[PDB]
Amino acid sequence: ADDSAIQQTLKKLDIQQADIQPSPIPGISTVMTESGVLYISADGKHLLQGPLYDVSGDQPINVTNQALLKKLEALSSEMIVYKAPEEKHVITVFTDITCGYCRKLHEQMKDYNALGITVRYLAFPRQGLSSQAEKDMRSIWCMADRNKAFDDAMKNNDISPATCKTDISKHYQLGVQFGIQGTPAIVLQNGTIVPGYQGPKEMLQMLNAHQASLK
């Protein structure tokens, strides 16, 4: 429980605000940083990049992503949720309002919903945290009705500037930690990252096959 050597190493590496937790491997800690998950030996000497896999069972399990799912769920109050009336599936989408495929996706929201697919958005500026995309998405996420603000944004209408204590930079960072490198990126209940756009029909097909629904 003395993460001092690791912290000293992180300082020399100039990594700040990293979260150091144990890993399933003895003598190695899970280090979650703003640009990825690291695995570092307790002595501070050795460093591997994520993800960590558990290949003990019949099928490999992505340990790192299972851990990140809990980080994903602590953001639920910051999600813009488009709920399907009768809900068969729930996906979490990292989206960028400036992205043509994210637009294409969003334009069909009523169709995804009609097919039982609930969509939950987190902000992910492809061009990073200092982009206009980031600022405009910050305003959207600060509105009392995020859904309306998001809809109007996607309809190209002007975005009123707003700021509040909600920090969507944490959304971007979680996305980087999941290994996401573009939008839209789908997070399944089961932990899998599915890059890229899929229309309502393809999405449902993929979800019914890969995403167990006990129902």
Ligand X SMILES: OC[C@H]1O[C@@](CO)(O[C@H]2O[C@H](CO)[C@@H](O)[C@H](O)[C@H]2O)[C@@H](O)[C@@H]1O
* Chain CA centroid to CA 8, Å: 29
Partner in contact with 77, chosen from a copy of itself, ligand X, none, beta carbon below 5 to 8 Å by kind: ligand X
Which tokens go with 151? Answer: 């809809």
Told to check if 156 binds ligand X by CB under 6 A, we report no
Which tokens go with 204? Answer: 């449902």
The yes-or-no answer on residue 142 being catalytic is no
- Catalytic entry in 3, 58, 99, 142: 99
The answer to whether 60 and 53 are in contact (CB under 8 A) is: yes
Binding residues for ligand X, rule CB under 6 A, total 9
Q: Measure the CA dihedral 131/135/138/140, to 10°.
A: -110
Told to check if 162 binds a copy of itself by CB under 8 A, we report no
The yes-or-no answer on residue 103 being catalytic is no
Options 28, 32, 143, 159; binder of ligand X; rule CB under 6 A:
143
Report CA-CA distances (Å) from 186 to 68, 132, 167, 195: 14, 23, 21, 6
Residue whose token pair is 């937790």: 21
For a copy of itself, the binding residues in 17-46 under the rule CB under 8 A are: 24-28, 39-41, 43-46
CB nearer ligand X, residue 12 or residue 165: 165
Residue 93: which H helix or E strand, with range?
strand 89-95
The yes-or-no answer on residue 126 being catalytic is yes
Binding residues for a copy of itself, rule CB under 8 A, total 28
Options 47, 69, 75, 193; binder of a copy of itself; rule CB under 8 A:
47
The yes-or-no answer on residue 164 being catalytic is no
Catalytic residues: 96, 99, 102, 126
